[model samples]
Target: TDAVLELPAATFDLPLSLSGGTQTTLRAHAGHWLVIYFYPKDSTPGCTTEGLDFNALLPEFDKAGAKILGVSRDSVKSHDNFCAKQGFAFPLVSDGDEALCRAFDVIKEKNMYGKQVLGIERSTFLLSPEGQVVQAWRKVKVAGHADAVLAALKAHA
Candidate 1:
């Protein structure tokens, strides 16, 4: 929606599952700058790189007063395995119902090997401490993305 460009203050409260069988809502992190990134799949090459990169920069992000949350349509079991394999410190939210995906409008029809299919177009949203979207990245490139986001957080937060 065009409203996203305006970075409207929106509440993204939703029941989501994370690793260790913990469940929580996005609203719980309202007082902190949050990095919510939606990736295509779990354990894939690009996804792995992104997760690892973000994990690698957790300390920096924490210093910048931002927390990271990765979202995917995968199951909690899948998220657990991914985190276990990658040793990611951040929680990965399972969006099996696509509630968050639909709200963020990250789901898109794209060409997958010349066949059009509906999937997540890699996207990230930086929500301010007040729950406003301060920065948004759609069709994100994995390389150096975590650094860029960290830079943005440092500059803004």
Candidate 2:
């Protein structure tokens, strides 16, 4: 984790559900590491790159016993579209109401195209098997980031 302040919570639970229509919680349990990533939006260039990178490395992640979740304020419908368009093999959780985004603290002021707005910061968290924080990346750059996360999973997941 960086110097950014972290909320002392083990997992994030939300009612918005995922692409599979399952209302679930985002928690790293006793034997699986969690790779939770926050993106600004669905179908955008950077977000698309990040998601595809994660998707491309899904086999490695599964082999490492780690699961990845992408989060954004976009609805599950939008997530479904994005995943289908990109042929992504992983799941993305909706944060349309911003409740889950608020819980994760990824919702923040963002600057884009010379304008400032509230949005999800591109971030990633590496959660240990016991649901403890292993590492955190904030304001992430999409290129090659999933590979970096995969490397960490290989080392610690």
Candidate 3:
């Protein structure tokens, strides 16, 4: 088994469930820049802040020709309701299977209430049009995080 560290992400043809009852795969983004942001859960404080920041920059992201996706282990229905309640139009991937998380190597062990638990590490990846990971940010801070991502995208192009 290869450690996916800095490897080409083009072959991860994962079946993805997005918000709004839609499904797609990584390959569908062949010709566009893709930002895949992984979080611990839906509607949580940090995740909610991060999602809204990204949602606010959606127009800029689209204008820059880059697509953004929020991902978590939550169910598709959870993602749907989260978006609905927040009035967010951005897509959130329901990675209940953890396949996408594993591919991105974002799952990590963390201490919660003095107990060890496995959780998503709040990572983000900027994938080029050819599926090469141009940049990777792990252990992400929610504050001004989306702005950094958008800055990276703009400078990248």
Candidate 4:
């Protein structure tokens, strides 16, 4: 296996269509952009805030022809509860095995309190309507960040 650290930014076609849906290879984000975000866990403070912020701003995102997807190593059941509790309008893909997270290179060796642990670094990916990655936000700080992404999407429109 190639060192994941050496993997430069690249997009992959993984069958998304989760959350009680069939697994379909997702690629075309055309006309509308793709906002793929990776959060540590659902219902947690920071994660909830970020997801809710996105939820609240779903209308704005739609105006910009952008679709938002929140990804995590959680089960479909977890995502279902989170979405229902938070009233999110977007799909939270269940990467229970972290396949997409690892493919996106967000899963890595992280340092917290000076201790090394393998985890998903909070990150976001902005993909063009053509399904090409346009921007990537790594090591993200989940405060006042959704607004920033909204701005970027609008600018591209």
Top candidate when judged by lDDT against the true structure: 3
Whichever of 2 and 3 has more TM-score, that candidate is 3
Q: Provide the lDDT at 137 for model 1.
A: 92
Put down candidate 2 lDDT per residue, 1-157, tens digits, no spaces. 4323354453443354787677657542456787889898899899998888888888888888788888887878898889899998878988778786676678788677899888777889887776666687888988879998888778764
TM-score of 4: 0.84
**Ranking of predictions according to lDDT:** 3, 1, 4, 2
All candidates: CA RMSD (Å): 2.8, 3.0, 3.1, 4.5
Could you tell me which residue pairs clash in candidate 4?
Answer: 29-129, 30-129
What ranges in model 1 sit over 4 Å off? Answer: 1-11, 111-116
Per-residue error at 14 for model 2, in Å? 3.5
* CA lDDT scores, all candidates in order: 0.86, 0.78, 0.87, 0.78
Residue 135 CA displacement from its true place in model 3, Å: 0.5
TM-score winner between 1 and 4, please give it: 1
- What tens digits encode model 4's per-residue C-alpha lDDT throughout 73-151? 8888888899888888888888888878887888889577889889988998787765556677889988988988888
Candidate 1: tens digits of C-alpha lDDT, residues 8-56:
2342556778877898776788788899999999999999999999999
Off by over 4 Å in 2: 1-11, 28-30, 110-116
Expressed as tens digits, the lDDT of each residue in 72-106 for candidate 3 is: 99998999889998988779999998888888888
- Of 1 and 2, which scores higher on lDDT? 1
What value of lDDT does candidate 2 attain over all alpha carbons? 0.78
